[PDB]
Amino acid sequence: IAAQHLADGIAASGPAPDLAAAAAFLEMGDRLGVVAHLDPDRTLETAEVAAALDLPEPALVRYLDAVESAGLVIREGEGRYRACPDFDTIRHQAGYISWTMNANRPFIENARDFFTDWDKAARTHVRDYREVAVSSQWMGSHAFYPTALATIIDAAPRKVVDLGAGTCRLLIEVLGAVPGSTGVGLDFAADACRAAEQAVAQAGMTDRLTVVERTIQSVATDPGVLEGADVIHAGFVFHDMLPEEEDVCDQVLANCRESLAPGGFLAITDAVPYLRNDRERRFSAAVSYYHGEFMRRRLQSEEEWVERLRGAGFSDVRALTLAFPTGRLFLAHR
Amino acid sequence: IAAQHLADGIAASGPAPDLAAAAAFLEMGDRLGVVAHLDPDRTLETAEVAAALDLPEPALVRYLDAVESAGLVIREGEGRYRACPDFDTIRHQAGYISWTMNANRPFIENARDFFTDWDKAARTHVRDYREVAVSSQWMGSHAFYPTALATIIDAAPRKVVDLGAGTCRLLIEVLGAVPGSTGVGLDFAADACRAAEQAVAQAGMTDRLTVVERTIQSVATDPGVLEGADVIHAGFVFHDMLPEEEDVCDQVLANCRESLAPGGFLAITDAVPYLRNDRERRFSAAVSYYHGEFMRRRLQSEEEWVERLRGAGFSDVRALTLAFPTGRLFLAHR
Ligand SMILES: CC(C)CC(=O)C(=O)O
Ligand SMILES: CC(C)CC(=O)C(=O)O
Ligand SMILES: [Cl-]
Ligand SMILES: [Cl-]
Ligand SMILES: [Zn+2]
Ligand SMILES: [Zn+2]
């Protein structure tokens, strides 16, 4: 009786216990600053990491021994832990869970308020931008960042502009692979711009990569920084301007097309709404419902994106399916 | 380039996007009261469910259309939705995610406080008991509740006592399958006891099933209600008394053994700490770390449980592996 109930229960639970445990351990560890020190090819030394993160070393060791028991890290002698061989895949998968269950938690917990008075709910139940950013990065590691990276590099560009560059991690990697290429990181957050400037100095690309503290919307009035770019990148940034800033968005796209060097392209990664195919539908619906219902940010279909980009003067647009469910890469050629 | 990155990304994400979306939709819907109306064998009528849950019907319809796009429900004509055929398995799997990421969220977000001043953190960062209860029920549906149910029924008992019966859902189902059997639901919460009393009246078992509002600990001093029971059930309740009430716990177990009718048994379901086998280790570590580090509730190994139950006078103890990772069923024969 109990053996039959055992196999059937194991099949019914499937991979959910493992993913549930991985996501909780990794979100907890990431908030503590520990996950950044975990890597499959090197150890973290507890005596040093506890001092660097201002944590009591015995508490850090109890956390690392629990994650070791979980199989997420390997104890390599006293006070040294290495991430398990497939850690980066586990962290990638945890990113989806973290994004839906942690970053978007204000929407899960207060839906009744958003249904009653959206304007009051939207200003009261605010997402933690750090959690949105980290969970997005983890989802991106294996499901959208490699495609955008390889597309920009294989074009062998002389000048690359990244709209919403953050800490300029993509631009630093593109310049390291393309000799003599220059870049321009555009981002409004002062915190992200200061961090980007110190990361370019470490990479040795201060002369090659310029960081500008300004909005995506300012590119509509002042497009100078875009001139002569072979590639312009815009990762999940345009839907934040829609539907309230449609005219500014269209002037930014028209300015991107005219600014491009001959043969240059604009590469936009964005989420398309409510797909029906079996692989993408579930996560597509969560992405779409969070954007449409809770954030009131307009996601455009492929057809809409192509119509808008051709309206901006782009001669041809190619849409590519990304592994990120509901994610599409649009390459708009000048 | 993008096709290779597509297949590799799909393999790296695996089932995480689908589980992340299912868990968020189901937690959101459960907090709204909607998930209780979703079942694969019948429709929910939006006009009635919106009035019963005091929700605007257009907001409920937008929620149900998003979950329909997700494949979790089927629209059966205007204003009627049915859960997808495998909904109960999806909800079961979501229970693990909900338990680690939602119910235990105070521990994820405030770990640094628990490491600095546990006593202050434990009284400040409190779990939502409703979320602990619902997520536990969803995990139990396919991973521990069927085994306990079938074990109690196949014993064909005359009297069953449930220690920590809640709304007496297990006892109502055991009495419905065993003719002439009587039951005693023991639970401290007044809210759970009132709900249990109205559920036994609906089932037509008021004379057969008695509900008592009292603690598990009171059974140590006053064991009368236990007399002549063929089966006593105790689902994940004993570790809440450890390590601070070890002597009371032992007197409750000794009283269970003496109270049993000849051939009777005590059935305890509980979590064992930090297993190393590949299937159970990850979720075992999250269960164990939340209990040991954050809640300071002692989980006992199988060896410890058997030693404690034999110390209570039980002649033989059998341990059975449950599908719930780190869950064990202990049958202690009088
Ligand atoms: C950056 C995306 C991956 C997610 C998104 O658009 C959001 O969290 O608002
Ligand atoms: C009831 C269990 C499944 C989980 C538990 O022991 C808890 O949440 O404290
Ligand atoms: Cl032209
Ligand atoms: Cl005896
Ligand atoms: Zn967004
Ligand atoms: Zn517990």
Secondary structure of B208-273 as H, E, C letters: CEEEEECCCCHHHHCCHHHCCCCEEEEECCHHHHCCCCHHHHHHHHHHHHHHCCCCCEEEEEEECC
Instruction: Residue A36: count other Cβ atoms within 10 Å of its Cβ.
Output: 13
Experimental technique behind these coordinates:
X-ray
H or E stretch including A177? helix A169-177
Q: Which two tokens stand for residue B53?
A: 């849950």
d(Cα B121, Cα B116) in Å, to the nearest integer?
Answer: 8
Q: How many CB atoms lie within 10 A of CB B126?
A: 9
- CB atoms closer than 10 angstroms to residue A119: 9
The neighbour count for residue A276, using CB atoms within 10 Å, is 10
Separation CA A286–CA A270 (nearest Å) = 15
Q: Quick one: how far is CA A252 from the chain centroid?
A: 22
Phi, psi of A179 (to 5 degrees): -60, 135
Q: Which two tokens stand for residue B269?
A: 């379901």
Q: Sheet containing A80-83: which strands, arranged edge to edge?
A: A43-45, A80-83, A73-75
The C-alpha atoms of residue A328 and residue B9 are separated, in whole angstroms, by 13
Spatial CB neighbours of A212, under 8 Å, sequence gap ≥ 6: A184, A185, A186, A187, A193, A225
Q: What is the number of the ligand closest to the CA of A315?
A: 3
3-class DSSP state of A274: coil
Start-to-end Cα distance in chain A: 68
B310 DSSP assignment: H
Using only C-alpha atoms, what is the Rg of chain A?
A: 22
* Torsion (CA) A311, A315, A320, A322 in degrees, nearest 10: -60
Is A6's CB within 8 Å of B279's CB?
A: no
Annotated resolution, angstroms: 2.0
Helix or strand holding residue A2 (H, E): helix A2-13
Cβ(B328)–Cβ(B321) below 8 Å: yes
Listing DSSP states for A12-26 in one string gives: HHTTHHHHHHHHHHH
Q: Which of residues 128-157 of B touch A (CB under 8 A)?
A: 142-144, 146-147, 150-151, 154
CA-to-CA distance for B283 and A19, rounded, in angstroms?
8
Amino acid symbol at B107: F
Q: Is A55 in the pocket of ligand 1 (CB under 6 A)?
A: no
- The rounded distance, in Å, linking the Cα atoms of B167 and B183 is 13
Q: Which two tokens stand for residue B223?
A: 């064991």
Contact B329 A2 (CB under 8 A): yes
| Residue pair A283/B21 in contact by the 8 Å Cβ criterion | yes
Atom of ligand 1 nearest to the CA of A297: 9
Start-to-end C-alpha separation, chain B: 68
CA B181 to chain centre: 24
Asked if A52 reaches chain B (Cβ–Cβ under 8 Å), the answer is no
* Residue A296, helix vs strand vs coil: coil
User: At residue B42, what is the residue type?
Assistant: R
Whose CA is closest to A153, among A90, A55, A231, A48?
A: A231
| Cβ-based neighbours of B47, under 8 Å, separated by 6 or more | B57, B79
Q: Is the dihedral of CA A268, A273, A277, A278 positive or negative?
A: positive
> What number of CA atoms fall less than 13 Å from residue B298's CA on the CB side?
13
CB contact under 8 A, B142 and A2: no
CB contact set of A141 (below 8 Å; sequence gap of 6+): A88, A91, A92, A95
Check if B121 contacts A (Cβ < 8 Å). no
Cβ–Cβ gap A282/B66 under 8 Å: no
| Burial (CB count <10 Å: 0-12, 13-18, 19+), residue A263 | exposed
| Structure-block tokens of residue A248 | 């500014």
B85 C-beta neighbours (distance < 10 Å), count: 11
For residue B79, the SS3 value is coil
Structure-block tokens of residue B171: 């006892």
**Short-list A312, A299, A184, CA closest to A240:** A299
B136 pocket-lining for ligand 2 (C-beta < 6 Å): yes
Q: At A9, list the tokens.
A: 């229960």
DSSP string of B101-142, one letter each residue: IIITHHHHHTHHHHHH-HHHHHHHS---HHHHHHHHHHHHHH
In A164-304, beta strands by DSSP E: 182-187, 209-213, 231-235, 265-271
Angle of CA points B81, A122, A135, to nearest 5°: 80
B210: amino acid identity, one letter: T
Neighbours of B8 (CB within 10 A): 15
**Structure token digits, residue A131:** 């959690």
- What type of residue is A210? T
Q: Is the dihedral of CA B269, B274, B280, B282 positive or negative?
A: positive
Give the sign of the dihedral formed by CA A241, CA A247, CA A249, CA A252: negative
Q: Give CA–CA dist A299/A121, Å, rounded.
A: 21
Q: Please tell me the distance between residue A313's alpha carbon and the centre of ligand 3 in angstroms.
A: 8
**In the 3-class helix/strand/coil scheme, how is B169-222 assigned residue by residue?**
HHHHHHHHHCCCCEEEEEECCHHHHHHHHHHHHHHCCCCCEEEEECCCCHHHHC
Strand B80-83 to B43-45 pairing: antiparallel
Which long-range contacts (C-beta less than 8 Å, at least 24 apart) are formed by A44-49? A44/A80, A44/A81, A44/A82, A45/A79, A45/A80, A46/A79, A46/A80, A46/A81, A47/A79
What structural domains and CATH numbers belong to chain B? 2-83 (1.10.10.10), 144-333 (3.40.50.150)
Sequence-separated (6 or more) residues with CB below 8 Å from residue A186: A161, A162, A163, A164, A165, A212, A214, A216, A219, A225
- Which residues, other chains included, contact B199 with Cβ-Cβ below 8 Å and sequence gap of 6+? B167, B168, B169, B172
